[PDB]
Amino acid sequence: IVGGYTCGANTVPYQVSLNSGYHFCGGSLINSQWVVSAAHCYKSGIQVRLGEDNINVVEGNEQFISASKSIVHPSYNSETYNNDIMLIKLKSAASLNSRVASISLPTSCASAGTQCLISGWGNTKSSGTSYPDVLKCLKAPILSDSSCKSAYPGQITSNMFCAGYLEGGKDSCQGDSGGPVVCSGKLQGIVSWGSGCAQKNKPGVYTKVCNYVSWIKQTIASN
Ligand SMILES: N=C(N)c1ccc(O[C@H]2CO[C@H]3[C@@H]2OC[C@H]3Oc2ccc(C(=N)N)cc2)cc1
Ligand SMILES: [Ca+2]
């Protein structure tokens, strides 16, 4: 997260860290047994880390649970990042508490201008690299589809949306991938792509979760 702030320990209780000997992506707890992340975060051998604040220190509220299954969206396209969503099943159900809690799926798509909270342990620099150990947060509004598509002509599909700031300075970034965009108490987005980070007229692009809620629900019910 570039231009954001320290969230505070466990203030984003649905945020998870995907770990394969190291943090490599974020994700969102949508119920005690399942996480939503980005398809581009796919890898084998994932451990889901819940209740995390400092990902390099055991602070006492962590739950480490291995994935039992990954499901990349049937139509994910790695060339264009279209349908950039994946489901991860936890080997054992998370124990829910104040610091480990699920986030609601939406029932409608969000309107331009709605404020959202985006979070993650991604790069905090727009130029160069710096990776933080505690979770960072950013408030960002959903941008008009026309400003989104004009920023990235030919490359935004109706399964994507832009949020952030055209002026730059404030954005998600590498390492935030797969993490949540939560708006009005619902998971409306997943950190997906962008050109660099916090660059002018290049806002973040996010997987439009409202277009996937029936797939999510059908898939989890059948697995
Ligand atoms: N694992 C690989 N080899 C891999 C997978 C995905 C890659 O690139 C895609 C395209 O861009 C995304 C995604 O992962 C890296 C980059 O992460 C972000 C996240 C946020 C923003 C933004 N809000 N400005 C920009 C890029 C590349 C290699
Ligand atoms: Ca920790």
From Swiss-Prot:
InterPro entries: Peptidase_S1_PA (IPR009003), Peptidase_S1_PA_chymotrypsin (IPR043504), Peptidase_S1A (IPR001314), Serine_Proteases_S1 (IPR050127), Trypsin_dom (IPR001254), TRYPSIN_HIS (IPR018114), TRYPSIN_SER (IPR033116). One of its GO terms (molecular function) is serpin family protein binding. Residues 1-221 form the Peptidase S1 domain. Its EC number is 3.4.21.4. GO terms for cellular component: extracellular space; serine protease inhibitor complex. Subsequent cleavage after Lys-125 leads to alpha-trypsin. Further cleavage after Lys-170 yields pseudotrypsin. A cleavage may also occur after Arg-99. The keyword Metal-binding applies. It catalyses: Preferential cleavage: Arg-|-Xaa, Lys-|-Xaa. It is found in: Secreted, Extracellular space. GO terms for biological process: digestion; proteolysis. Binds 1 Ca(2+) ion per subunit. It comes from the Eukaryota. Substrate binds at D171, S172, Q174, G175, S177. Disulfide bonds join C7-C137, C25-C41, C109-C210, C116-C183, C148-C162, C173-C197. Interacts with SERPINA1. Belongs to the peptidase S1 family. This is Serine protease 1.
